[PDB]
Amino acid sequence: RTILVTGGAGYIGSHTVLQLLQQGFRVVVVDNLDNASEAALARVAELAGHDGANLVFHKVDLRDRHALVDIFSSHRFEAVIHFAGLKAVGESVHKPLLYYDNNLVGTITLLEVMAANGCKKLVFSSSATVYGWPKEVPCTEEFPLCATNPYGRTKLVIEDICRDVHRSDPDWKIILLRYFNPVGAHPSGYIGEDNNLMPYVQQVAVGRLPHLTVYGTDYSTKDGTGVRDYIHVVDLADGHIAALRKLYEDSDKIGCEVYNLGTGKGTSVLEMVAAFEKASGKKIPLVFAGRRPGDAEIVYAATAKAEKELKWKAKYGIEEMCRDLWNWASKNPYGY
Amino acid sequence: LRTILVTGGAGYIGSHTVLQLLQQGFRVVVVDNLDNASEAALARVAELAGHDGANLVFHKVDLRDRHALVDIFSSHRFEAVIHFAGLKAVGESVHKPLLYYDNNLVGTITLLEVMAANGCKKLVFSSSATVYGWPKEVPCTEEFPLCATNPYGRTKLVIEDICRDVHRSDPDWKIILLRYFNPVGAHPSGYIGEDPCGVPNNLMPYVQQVAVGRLPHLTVYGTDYSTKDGTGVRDYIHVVDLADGHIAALRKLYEDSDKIGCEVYNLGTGKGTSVLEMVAAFEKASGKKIPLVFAGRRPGDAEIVYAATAKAEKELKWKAKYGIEEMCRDLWNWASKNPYGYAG
Ligand SMILES: NC(=O)c1ccc[n+]([C@@H]2O[C@H](COP(=O)([O-])OP(=O)(O)OC[C@H]3O[C@@H](n4cnc5c(N)ncnc54)[C@H](O)[C@@H]3O)[C@@H](O)[C@H]2O)c1
Ligand SMILES: O=c1ccn([C@@H]2O[C@H](COP(=O)(O)OP(=O)(O)O[C@H]3O[C@H](CO)[C@@H](O)[C@H](O)[C@H]3O)[C@@H](O)[C@H]2O)c(=O)[nH]1
Ligand SMILES: O=c1ccn([C@@H]2O[C@H](COP(=O)(O)OP(=O)(O)O[C@H]3O[C@H](CO)[C@@H](O)[C@H](O)[C@H]3O)[C@@H](O)[C@H]2O)c(=O)[nH]1
């Protein structure tokens, strides 16, 4: 069984490719290497051992229709997992056309080529950013949707495109996965991430930054700092194995489904700092600051739908995430 | 010399706007792929424009053809772009959503990128009152909540949001989004007008085909709404008034650029008219009788929608000059002189 993984050289994608190879899939990755190194997939192939030969890599942009058509014509794909996209919020505010072009034109082209080739099974990387600034927690998949920056708008637009495609053509089977806050690295520390709290904390721990600025101390949370659902990247990867299994075993009873991928636990900024201090043995000097414009106060997942319908629950906790980030970053201070 | 690039200018609203522009002395470059129009509308525009027809140049190009679009922008100095190009059939958008997302979003994104790279950051965009969805009150002001109820409507709202994000990223952009209400009618000469393919999806093109004998009756979709007669109520605006609202938008960009960023204005009349009232007005204009069939509501239809005109009146200095009687007169003149459209 062969899976096309767009964006598979990136953070979540590379961890997912490793698990797919262990599960016995043939994997074809398409990635333009805009935001990733080819070394990530070389290392994934090493970690895959006996299954490393089942990984094929093509340096292709999804907007290159001809190149994409040739990839689909050379393989019979069971499904596509679509991680490719740009994701930096600040860059999206400064360069919105870059984001709308890359994310929307790349996705639309992929969907068209998929339909023309008869591959109508998709798993899409969405994000909890589509819940906006939620009025209540935990956030269920039925919550009101609204994006708060151009990057988030691209994710919500793509979800809506997928729902419209499914309504137009019931042969499509689509799973949208709303990831919460990814942290960590494979526990080998040989692959990992190469703009967010925990990467900043780790840089403070090694002295590359003098302090962590804490954005907001007057929130209505236990310690006054912002609260998020931090989820180990290996758990996120595993949720994609569950999504392929759902498409493989339960396609007759799904259409365009959406599931949160989170832990269901909210952890504050200071709690994550404390967990990282314990993992690293380092102190993280703090500067307390005002709220950061655009920040939600508290966001975490309602896990019930994923637990019952996707048959998936996260397995790793925040201390483990912090240890695995520390291990990767200590062994690889400059990434790959 | 002032030159305007008009995308989608071979279509219904675009052709009427091209004509008004030519009559004001603008040079007009039209980009249109002719997917939903023929050259005939533009050739009649050029005929009505007299010697000013020499000031209309037509480029048969798709907005997604980046190389061809770059060639146009690099060889012209444009004061502004008016962007009418797009697909607009609701039912087709539900059945073929990728066609709509591709044409409308990829075309618009390509256009904005080519504009920005070639130093033309002045845009007037064809939006729609569809973004108000099912309004909780009327009249609808520009600050009402925005939604989309079908894939076509989603493309319009997404493009409005792209434009707002582009402006926020780069204050040299000046963008006017125009939310059209329900366009009806034709230039009073009767030489140009709406020429739909197939069975018309909208009320007044359907009515006129009944009046000229090509279809046997109008089906009325829904008679149980909470309105005066039970049928849907809309703000019908003469297409020539819509065209004049674009002249007003260009004037605002030309004279008031500093005070604006990415602004939005309704283009409507502020009056709601029901389906039955439009049929009666068309019977009076045409002298024909329109037989009716009664049916249930059409999925997705709003009950009552009409414009709050105060912002356009104050800030664009624009108000509609035509009423329902004139819209119906002008539609009938186009229909009876061209019962089979441009093809004859
Ligand atoms: N009249 C309405 O029902 C109505 C009301 C509100 C808003 N609008 C919007 O107003 C605009 C004009 O309306 P209209 O009645 O003149 O529609 P129309 O279909 O007559 O005009 C659209 C024109 O755009 C052209 N076009 C489409 N895709 C193109 C592309 N990629 N490149 C170049 N040209 C392309 C078509 O060939 C057509 O001539 C449209 O964008 C429409 O969505 C429609
Ligand atoms: O230097 C920092 C960075 C973050 N925070 C706080 O830490 C928490 C997490 O922040 P961050 O890592 O920026 O994540 P989010 O605010 O949840 O959102 C970012 O991270 C998400 C997960 O990767 C993405 O989906 C979003 O698009 C992206 O804006 C927030 O409460 C922040 O206020 C700080 O106090 N100091
Ligand atoms: O054969 C018909 C067609 C329409 N109607 C009724 O007539 C009214 C107007 O319908 P229509 O002409 O189809 O316009 P709307 O659906 O209001 O849509 C128009 O008004 C919106 C506001 O801009 C635009 O988005 C649309 O593209 C534009 O075509 C509605 O109450 C319809 O139920 C009928 O009874 N029979």
Residue numbers in the entry:
A (entry chain B): 7 to 200, 206 to 347
B (entry chain A): 6 to 349
What did the published study say regarding this structure?
BZU3 encodes a UDP-Glc 4-epimerase and plays a key role in controlling cell wall synthesis during the morphogenesis of maize stomata. It also catalyzes epimerization of UDP-N-acetylgalactosamine (UDP-GalNAc) to UDP-N-acetylglucosamine (UDP-GlcNAc), regulating N-glycosylation patterns of many proteins that may be involved in cell wall synthesis and signaling pathways.
The flexible sugar moiety was held in place in the vicinity of the catalytic triad of Ser-Tyr-Lys (S133/Y157/K161). S133 forms a bifurcated contact with the sugar moiety of the substrate, whereas both Y157 and K161 directly interact with the ribose moiety of NAD+. Consistent with this result, the transgene of BZU3pro:BZU3Y157F-YFP failed to rescue the stomatal phenotype in bzu3-2. With UDP-Gal as substrate, the Km (Michaelis–Menten constant), Vmax (the maximum reaction velocity), and Kcat/Km were 1.45 mM, 1.41 mM·min−1, and 650.3 s−1·mM−1 respectively. Km, Vmax, and Kcat/Km were 2.67 mM, 0.69 mM·min−1, and 172.4 s−1·mM−1, respectively, when using UDP-Glc as substrate.
